[PDB]
Structure 1
Amino acid sequence: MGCVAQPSSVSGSLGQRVSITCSGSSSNVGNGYVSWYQLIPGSAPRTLIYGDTSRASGVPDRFSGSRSGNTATLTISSLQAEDEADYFCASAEDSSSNAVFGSGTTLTVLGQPKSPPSVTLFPPSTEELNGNKATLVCLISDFYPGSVTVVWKADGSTITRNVETTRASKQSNSKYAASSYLSLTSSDWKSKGSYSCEVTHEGSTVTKTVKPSECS
């Protein structure tokens, strides 16, 4: 757990710059050789900077590090959507005794295109229905920014019982995914004319519908 103090969040617009500070003490940052790491959902952590200022293999010159005494700074210029990530600083603590990481900073890159969600609704399988259960699955992809709201309907009634919805998770591309599950008895599935998943994103709604008369 965190030792070096970093801002929990920073933002900058596309093509612009942002700085992340990393505040320690004489026992860590003050002894120098600060490093920085980038963590993006799909990937292993990636070393960006070491020795306060040196760029690691494959790291472009728009990532720069500096240090003054007990504070180190990472600056990212020419911001791109692909730079959205959690950034962590680190250093040796009391030399070879220990190493300490910072508290981490989430970078948001402003000015990206709005992207509405793609919605797929799957009815229960025959196999699940044979166990007298029915799960409806609503899969929501490729949306930006990363905030949706999901409503379930049956024959025009809003349903909330036995709905489970995930948080939005940042994809391979700065866009987001989420899923929502409606758990029914096979009895309840067969007793309605239709079920819908209604997904709202930035004021716009996409609705998909499945009908027991047409499915499973």
Structure 2
Amino acid sequence: AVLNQPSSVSGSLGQRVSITCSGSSSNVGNGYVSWYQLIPGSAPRTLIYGDTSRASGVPDRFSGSRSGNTATLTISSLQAEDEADYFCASAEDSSSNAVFGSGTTLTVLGQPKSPPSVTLFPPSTEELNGNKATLVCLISDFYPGSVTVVWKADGSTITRNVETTRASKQSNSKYAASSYLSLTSSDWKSKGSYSCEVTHEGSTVTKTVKPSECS
């Protein structure tokens, strides 16, 4: 019982993009379709209400329409901040019974690529007092969101005890990811250098920490 929406919709930068909301006569047939925008890290944003009426603070590029049982949302001059999930909704058989759409993910093409920002933190002194050490490597602001991460200890590639999260999309269309190296306290002070080598689109960024010169 969910209005049919396209799964993926891709539009070029500065170009037009349409999202159809194929419904029936009980819901979209009733002329009151609403549209909503879902940006990661923010509360849902009401875009259009009552087919064609824009909300407050939504640009003219977001135009709503409907022909019979099908409502469409048109985004003109698409930007990088328009990348989100869009949902259509309307009442059905009652003013307090509404159905949403299956969802449409907008991915805007043509964005420029950006190198990843790598930051590596040593294990805190407070954590070292529990005979435990965790190296936090934070990667942020890289596009596209494909990043390969490898650790090293004095040139030797680490494999064990490494847990890396997937690339989560930030609010500014770019992606972010983290990586954790949980070590024993003896294993932390057992090497000379620890490196978080991050590779992204061939360009490799690396940060290094040295337990001897880190106090």
Task: State the TM bucket, normalised to the shorter chain.
Answer: over 0.9
For 2:97 and 2:157, the matched residues in 1 are separated by: 55
Output one character per residue of 1:162-206: Cα deviation in whole Å (capped at 9) or x when no partner. 222122222231112111111000111111121111111112111
Q: CA deviation at 1:22?
A: 1.0
Aligned to 2:98: 99
Q: CA deviation at 1:96?
A: 2.5
State the SS of the aligned residue for 1:31: coil
For 1:98 and 1:161, the matched residues in 2 are separated by: 52
Matched, 1:121 2:154: no
TM-score (norm 2): 0.95
Between 84-93 and 37-46, the greater mean CA deviation after superposition:
37-46
Q: CA deviation at 1:27?
A: 1.9
Output one character per residue of 1:22-77: Cα deviation in whole Å (capped at 9) or x when no partner. 11222211212000001112322111111111111111211111112222110100
Q: Which runs of 5+ in 1 are unaligned?
A: none
Q: In 2 relative to 1, CA 92–8 (structure 1 residues): closer, same or farther, beyond 3 Å?
A: same
Q: CA deviation at 1:159?
A: 2.0
Q: In 2 relative to 1, CA 30–160 (structure 1 residues): closer, same or farther, beyond 3 Å?
A: farther
Between 73-82 and 22-31, the greater mean CA deviation after superposition:
22-31
Q: Which runs of 5+ in 2 are unaligned?
A: none
Output one character per residue of 1:84-129: Cα deviation in whole Å (capped at 9) or x when no partner. 1111111112222511111111111111111101101111111111
For 2:133 and 2:176, the matched residues in 1 are separated by: 23
State the SS of the aligned residue for 1:214: coil
TM-score (norm 1): 0.94
For 1:189 and 1:15, the matched residues in 2 are separated by: 50
Q: CA deviation at 1:10?
A: 0.8
For 1:8 and 1:147, the matched residues in 2 are separated by: 21
For 1:98 and 1:34, the matched residues in 2 are separated by: 13
Between 166-175 and 7-16, the greater mean CA deviation after superposition:
166-175
Aligned to 1:151: 150
Identical-residue share of aligned pairs (%):
98
Aligned to 2:32: 33
Q: CA deviation at 1:215?
A: 2.0
Q: CA deviation at 1:147?
A: 1.9
Q: CA deviation at 1:155?
A: 2.4
State the SS of the aligned residue for 2:29: helix
CA RMSD of aligned residues (A): 1.4
Q: CA deviation at 1:153?
A: 1.3
